[PDB]
Design an enzyme around this catalytic site. Structure first.
Site, PDB file in Angstrom:
ATOM      1  N   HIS A 103       3.396  -3.544  -9.929  1.00 23.04           N
ATOM      2  CA  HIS A 103       2.175  -3.737  -9.157  1.00 23.04           C
ATOM      3  C   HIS A 103       0.937  -3.508 -10.021  1.00 23.04           C
ATOM      4  O   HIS A 103       0.974  -2.731 -11.001  1.00 23.04           O
ATOM      5  CB  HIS A 103       2.131  -2.853  -7.898  1.00 23.04           C
ATOM      6  CG  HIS A 103       2.034  -1.378  -8.169  1.00 23.04           C
ATOM      7  ND1 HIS A 103       3.059  -0.647  -8.734  1.00 23.04           N
ATOM      8  CD2 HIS A 103       1.046  -0.487  -7.902  1.00 23.04           C
ATOM      9  CE1 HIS A 103       2.697   0.620  -8.830  1.00 23.04           C
ATOM     10  NE2 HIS A 103       1.483   0.744  -8.325  1.00 23.04           N
ATOM     11  N   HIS A 110      -3.317  10.610  -7.164  1.00 24.30           N
ATOM     12  CA  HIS A 110      -4.187   9.470  -7.450  1.00 24.30           C
ATOM     13  C   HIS A 110      -5.675   9.829  -7.421  1.00 24.30           C
ATOM     14  O   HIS A 110      -6.394   9.418  -6.505  1.00 24.30           O
ATOM     15  CB  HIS A 110      -3.838   8.348  -6.477  1.00 24.30           C
ATOM     16  CG  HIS A 110      -2.420   7.895  -6.608  1.00 24.30           C
ATOM     17  ND1 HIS A 110      -1.358   8.644  -6.149  1.00 24.30           N
ATOM     18  CD2 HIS A 110      -1.883   6.803  -7.204  1.00 24.30           C
ATOM     19  CE1 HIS A 110      -0.230   8.027  -6.447  1.00 24.30           C
ATOM     20  NE2 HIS A 110      -0.519   6.908  -7.085  1.00 24.30           N
ATOM     21  N   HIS A 127       6.038   5.003  -4.023  1.00 26.69           N
ATOM     22  CA  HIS A 127       5.198   5.929  -3.272  1.00 26.69           C
ATOM     23  C   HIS A 127       3.953   5.285  -2.668  1.00 26.69           C
ATOM     24  O   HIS A 127       3.124   5.990  -2.088  1.00 26.69           O
ATOM     25  CB  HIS A 127       4.807   7.158  -4.111  1.00 26.69           C
ATOM     26  CG  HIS A 127       3.888   6.859  -5.263  1.00 26.69           C
ATOM     27  ND1 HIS A 127       3.921   7.579  -6.440  1.00 26.69           N
ATOM     28  CD2 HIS A 127       2.906   5.938  -5.413  1.00 26.69           C
ATOM     29  CE1 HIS A 127       3.005   7.105  -7.268  1.00 26.69           C
ATOM     30  NE2 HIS A 127       2.375   6.109  -6.669  1.00 26.69           N
ATOM     31  N   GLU A 160       3.566   3.353 -14.198  1.00 28.44           N
ATOM     32  CA  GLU A 160       3.865   4.717 -13.731  1.00 28.44           C
ATOM     33  C   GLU A 160       5.387   5.036 -13.747  1.00 28.44           C
ATOM     34  O   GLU A 160       5.789   6.199 -13.642  1.00 28.44           O
ATOM     35  CB  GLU A 160       3.204   5.012 -12.367  1.00 28.44           C
ATOM     36  CG  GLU A 160       3.815   4.307 -11.169  1.00 28.44           C
ATOM     37  CD  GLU A 160       2.976   4.465  -9.902  1.00 28.44           C
ATOM     38  OE1 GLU A 160       1.971   5.204  -9.918  1.00 28.44           O
ATOM     39  OE2 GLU A 160       3.314   3.843  -8.874  1.00 28.44           O
TER      40      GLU A 160
HETATM   41  O1  LIG Z   1      -1.631  -1.166  -2.427  1.00 33.26           O
HETATM   42  C1  LIG Z   1      -0.547  -0.632  -2.789  1.00 33.26           C
HETATM   43  O2  LIG Z   1       0.571  -1.133  -2.474  1.00 33.26           O
HETATM   44  C2  LIG Z   1      -0.555   0.673  -3.561  1.00 33.26           C
HETATM   45  C3  LIG Z   1      -1.649   1.561  -3.497  1.00 33.26           C
HETATM   46  C4  LIG Z   1      -1.624   2.772  -4.213  1.00 33.26           C
HETATM   47  O3  LIG Z   1      -2.702   3.621  -4.150  1.00 33.26           O
HETATM   48  C5  LIG Z   1      -0.498   3.109  -4.979  1.00 33.26           C
HETATM   49  O4  LIG Z   1      -0.427   4.298  -5.661  1.00 33.26           O
HETATM   50  C6  LIG Z   1       0.587   2.227  -5.042  1.00 33.26           C
HETATM   51  O5  LIG Z   1       1.689   2.551  -5.783  1.00 33.26           O
HETATM   52  C7  LIG Z   1       0.561   1.010  -4.338  1.00 33.26           C
HETATM   53 FE   LIG Z   2       1.057   6.360  -8.446  1.00 37.58          FE
END
Ligand SMILES: O=C(O)c1cc(O)c(O)c(O)c1
Ligand SMILES: [Fe+2]
Ligand SMILES: O=C(O)c1cc(O)c(O)c(O)c1
Ligand SMILES: [Fe+2]
Ligand SMILES: [Fe+2]
Ligand SMILES: [Fe+2]
Lengths: 416, 416
Positions: A191, A58, A11, A238
């Site tokens: 991530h 978020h 997402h 998550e």
């Molecule tokens: O910088 C990102 O790729 C990124 C940013 C977010 O706010 C997020 O929730 C995520 O799953 C990835």
């Molecule tokens: Fe998230």
């Protein structure tokens, strides 16, 4: 009442940005769309009536009050403002009836929930939805959103997410309408978007997690937050939300499609599952689950002059409750006393709603779906007490009503 | 870590008003005070450090987002505005440490929670407190509020409230400080305040319920909402919270006091219970329970450049996360870009907090306890992308950071 399958998708706002900047044609961005396409095609071909949609907000709509399992029970949901304005998207439609039935089963299974309406959906929902479903005039299906509190620890155990999914399966199955339901879980894969560790990925873990989620999800059920954060980055943990969706699917699934792309911060992945149905009969028949879900309020209709504030009523009365609720704002209740017509002219109220308020139709409002506590506040605003409202509910003068009490007294919720 | 006992008390705004209007002289109102006096005196005598305080918010602070078990984790609480201004009461202090511990234990026991800070306490809370505790200058103890969502159905079952109370007992006992804790259950007894049945009371049930709650509470665990509303009136069924309190006490208790008074709409009752300790040692030791409560985040300390957003960090970062969160409001963000210093001057931020934001100290903000998603909103507001913030996290230029990615792309959460 028939689950057709479900999908899991990242997402990250990268996805939203791609749609909004038309990076469709750009070869650097294009694998995102190629990744999503089979999921998109499957949804267009299978046409679920409703997608039960699992995501996390978020710290946009959920912040000062933050809950674990937040069931969206409302009619519609617009995009949230995340500091750069609302995305140009139409509201998606909810399903209050399905949402109610699910709440009822999940509560009977001893899960603790939150209910919500009227707040925006942030990138956690609309980032991937915007690539998976065409959105002119509205959206192809309804969604019942489930927003999960995965960012403020402690959060529920991996197995709790799983067990939620299992109850969800039965709840959906036992819903007494012959409709098609898909189940989505969004987020991940690996991530970390914070701290000096920002930029962590682990493709090796991503592949194994994908493999295990599809074919042996029970192997993941003893994983801790620490395990998941170490292997896939802090926010990568998550993916418990993938376990919830997967738990709602059949013990075995057909993996129709999967994709994996890491351009930047986030492992962007999709997984598409065809439900295979139940091999085993359920421990409890639909008939018996439906009776167990309604047993708390079985017989409640026998109670005269009583309007239980169930989810359907909360949704029916939402606009008016929301308007009366703002009377706790000093500037709003000032305008309500001084220029009520100016306040109505600006509201989203129907004529019927305005008229009930304007007439001070106490019982009329209870009948309509207004919760007494909104009337309690309105009473305070107008400098009249609770006893005035109660007597109105009984169709009696205050003096006549007061004769039913052991003492004749007055009070309100008014402060200083 | 020591539970001294608990008390059950009505929370009707008749009590708040009785106090604010100085009705102690009027014999019609007198017995409200006569009834509360022994509980007042027990509190002054026993001096608990914290009252764990179970109440329901009457759709004031909880409306559009409405949870089943909402645990107050913040530093202090002010009275809510319920349409007639805030009551003239000093803020009461929270206990974030006790609250985090209790969260951890309850989640391990598989209760699903909500966490909240900074919202006002309505009459559910301050109505009886104002008569129980002197507040000339602050309050004698701290509280940990548990706001229960008992008004929007489906709500948790009677047995679920009780079981919550059972875990809460062990949660409090296992807390590693020798503080004295009292537990409060508020609401009740019989009343209905909506519809044509408004004014229903049932003294005969109220007495049975008091009896049974004191000396045979498990005999109440099969009651449905229908049972409770039919016997005690619709809102009377909130006595499920009395059950939660009673679940947190020793299996047997000494009733020190009870009172009952029915002047107007509500049966105003108090019950005071002395805890008797534990006859036999618990199924699980305090130490094993803490082990279980902490295992999800055990060894998280070994993850470098990582700052779990736990409750203590949520409390530490509240002011600044709150401020940055407001960047989602169009008018606020426009002031932030155009006159930040005016905005800072109006706010409750500390000088350190102002500096962090002024200097755009991305990593310093993470260290302080700002959650990244607030920074994400801030970058968006300022016309820069996620990449920029990630690069600063790492201490690299953007081009130097982009080299660590598979492709060099830019994106944000910006809308239209
Ligand atoms: O910088 C990102 O790729 C990124 C940013 C977010 O706010 C997020 O929730 C995520 O799953 C990835
Ligand atoms: Fe998230
Ligand atoms: O009018 C009453 O006696 C009353 C009103 C309330 O708003 C309430 O929460 C309550 O427990 C009692
Ligand atoms: Fe679009
Ligand atoms: Fe006072
Ligand atoms: Fe109440």
């Amino acid at each position: 009442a028939k689950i057709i399958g479900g999908f899991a998708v990242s997402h990250t706002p990268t996805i939203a940005f791609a749609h909004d900047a038309n990076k469709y044609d750009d070869p650097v961005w294009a694998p995102i769309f190629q990744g999503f396409e089979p999921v998109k095609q499957w949804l267009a071909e299978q046409k679920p009536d409703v997608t039960f949609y699992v995501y996390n907000d978020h710290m946009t709509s959920f912040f000062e009050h933050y809950s674990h399992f937040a069931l969206g029970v409302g009619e519609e949901y617009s995009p949230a403002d995340e500091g750069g304005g609302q995305r140009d998207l139409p509201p998606i439609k909810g399903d209050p009836e399905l949402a109610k039935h699910i709440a009822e089963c999940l509560v009977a299974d001893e899960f603790d929930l939150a209910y919500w309406q009227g707040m925006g959906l942030d990138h956690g929902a609309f980032s991937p939805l915007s690539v998976l479903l065409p959105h002119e005039h509205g959206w192809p299906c309804r969604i019942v959103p489930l927003q999960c509190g995965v960012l403020q620890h402690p959060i529920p155990k991996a197995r709790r997410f799983w067990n939620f999914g299992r109850s969800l399966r039965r709840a959906i199955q036992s819903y007494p309408r012959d409709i098609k339901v898909a189940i989505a879980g969004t987020g991940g894969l690996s991530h970390q978007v914070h701290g000096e560790r920002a930029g962590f990925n682990n493709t090796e873990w991503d592949m194994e997690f994908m493999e295990r989620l599809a074919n042996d999800p029970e192997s993941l059920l003893g994983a801790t937050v620490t395990d998941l954060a170490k292997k896939g980055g802090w926010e990568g943990a998550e993916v418990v939300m993938w376990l919830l969706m997967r738990g709602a699917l059949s013990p075995e699934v057909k993996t129709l499609h999967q994709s994996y792309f890491l351009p930047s911060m986030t492992a962007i992945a999709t997984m598409l599952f065809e439900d295979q149905g139940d091999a085993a009969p359920p421990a409890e028949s639909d008939e018996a689950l439906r009776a167990r879900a309604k047993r708390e309020l079985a017989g409640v209709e026998e109670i005269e002059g009583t309007y239980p504030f169930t989810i359907d009523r909360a949704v029916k009365g939402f606009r008016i409750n929301h308007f009366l609720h703002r009377l706790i704002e000093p500037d709003f209740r000032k305008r309500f006393v001084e220029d009520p017509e100016g306040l109505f002219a600006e509201s989203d109220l129907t004529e019927e709603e305005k008229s009930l308020i304007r007439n001070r139709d106490w019982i009329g409002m209870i009948h309509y779906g207004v919760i007494f506590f909104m009337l309690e506040k309105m009473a305070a605003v107008l400098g009249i007490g609770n006893i005035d409202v109660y007597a109105a509910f009984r169709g009696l003068s205050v003096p006549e009503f007061q004769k039913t009490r052991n003492a004749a007294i007055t009070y309100s919720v008014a402060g200083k």
